[PDB]
């Protein structure tokens, strides 16, 4: 019933893009696939935190369980969640 | 519904983000009535984007293709 090739938690299917991109490029790439970056609050207290940690979140910062984050020149992996 | 991880054809892989040696990771999966991923079972699947560079059942890191692993510590999956 589910074609989700990734992490499925509550109707949301997260598909990993293992290419390192900036935050804007990752957001645009998910948008081009009719998807968005994971919400930090949606995955922080779930088992997904072991996967989506240190990847781009929808809020503009890497999803962390917690110095001077300079995260405008950084490149990370990302997940896209959509329908 | 109860798979807290990656589900590929009846197999549910759960990620352990703690760094352990091959023996410790194998023992931890055994303590959970599980085994390390088979390299051939996940090499030609979409799971390779997740389980790459983690411990495999053969004693070596699961790497795409390729061909001292005794003091290394890596993450691992139990199924």
């Amino acid at each position: 019933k589910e074609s989700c090739n990734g992490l499925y938690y509550q109707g949301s299917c997260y598909i990993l893009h293992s290419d390192y991109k900036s935050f804007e490029d990752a957001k645009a790439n998910c948008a081009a696939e009719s998807s968005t970056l994971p919400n930090k609050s949606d995955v922080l207290t779930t088992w997904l935190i072991d996967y989506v940690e240190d990847t781009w979140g929808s809020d503009g910062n890497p999803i962390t369980k917690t110095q001077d984050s300079d995260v405008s020149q950084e490149v990370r992996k990302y997940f896209c969640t959509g329908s | 519904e109860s798979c807290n991880g990656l589900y590929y054809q009846g197999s549910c892989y759960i990620l352990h983000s703690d760094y352990k040696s091959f023996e410790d990771a194998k023992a931890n999966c055994a303590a959970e009535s599980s085994t390390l991923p088979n390299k051939s079972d996940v090499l030609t699947t979409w799971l390779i984007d997740y389980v790459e560079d983690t411990w495999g059942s053969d004693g070596n890191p699961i790497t795409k293709t390729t061909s001292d692993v005794s003091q290394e510590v890596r993450k691992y999956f139990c199924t």
């Epitope: 996967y51 240190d54 490149v75 | 990620l15 983000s17 997740y50 790459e52 560079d53 795409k64 390729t66």
Partner: antibody, heavy 125, light 108 residues
Framework: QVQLQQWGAGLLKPSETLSLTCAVS????????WTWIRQPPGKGLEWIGE???????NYNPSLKSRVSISVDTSKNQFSLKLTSVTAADTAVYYC???????????????????WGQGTLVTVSS | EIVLTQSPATLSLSPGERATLSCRAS??????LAWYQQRPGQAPRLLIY???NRATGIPARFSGSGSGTDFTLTISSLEPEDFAVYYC?????????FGPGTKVDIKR
């Protein structure tokens, strides 16, 4: 803004041991692999080895006989030792960072950013 | 071991021209290839990783393409700051190797 700084003996007699240290500020030290890359003067670049904060090391097979890379996590530093220094080891040595945050799972980062200013090591008696 | 080769050894172009450097591999490296620019007396500076993606703050005149065993770096219009040596890089098996490098000269 990641910053790297190197120091070490810039003049070595043959058969001595090379010792260089790289210090890191402005980034997550336990979040990337850290490498040493040497360029002999006027020639191309050669990768020496890499290390992670967990103690995992990878060495170039052509230099594995006499290359050791250590890590000081409490000081955000990592060192390089090259025993049996020959005249061929005269080079400018850079410490760099693997620019992809090493997650521990999935495809591995393959580029170097940023680079250190470089430390020339000259081999002569 | 995978060997990277770069051709030509030297590219002679006037300012404003389009420079096209190529890098070949002995066997396939997928998209795990990077490009660097090194000026005389300086450390190498990363230009493109994943063979296609520009680094942070690298001008848009630098472009990268190729996957497998053939890669090309392209500068649409050369600036006087762009006349330097360009190095090819890859990661495979357990190791990193570099190409011989290509120096972009001033055509005369």
């Amino acid at each position: 803004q990641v910053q790297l700084q190197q120091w070490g003996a810039g003049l070595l007699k043959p058969s001595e041991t090379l010792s260089l240290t790289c210090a890191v500020s402005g980034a997550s030290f336990s979040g990337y692999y850290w490498t040493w890359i040497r360029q002999p003067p006027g020639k191309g670049l050669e990768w020496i080895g890499e290390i992670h904060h967990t103690g995992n090391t990878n060495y170039n097979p052509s230099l594995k006989s006499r290359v050791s890379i250590s890590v000081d996590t409490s000081k955000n530093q990592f060192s390089l030792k090259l025993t049996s220094v020959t005249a061929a080891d005269t080079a400018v040595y850079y410490c760099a960072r693997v620019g992809g945050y090493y997650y521990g799972w999935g495809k591995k980062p393959h580029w170097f950013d940023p680079w250190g200013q470089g430390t020339l090591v000259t081999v002569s008696s | 071991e995978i060997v990277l080769t770069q051709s030509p050894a030297t590219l002679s172009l006037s300012p404003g021209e389009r420079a096209t450097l190529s890098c070949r591999a002995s066997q396939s490296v997928s998209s795990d290839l990077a490009w660097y620019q090194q000026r005389p007396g300086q450390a190498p500076r990363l230009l493109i990783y994943d063979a296609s993606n520009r680094a942070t703050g690298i001008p848009a005149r630098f472009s990268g393409s190729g996957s497998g065993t053939d890669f090309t770096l392209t500068i649409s219009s050369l600036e006087p700051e762009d006349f330097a040596v360009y190095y090819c890089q890859q990661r495979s098996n357990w190791g990193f190797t570099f190409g011989p490098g290509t120096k972009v000269d001033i055509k005369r």
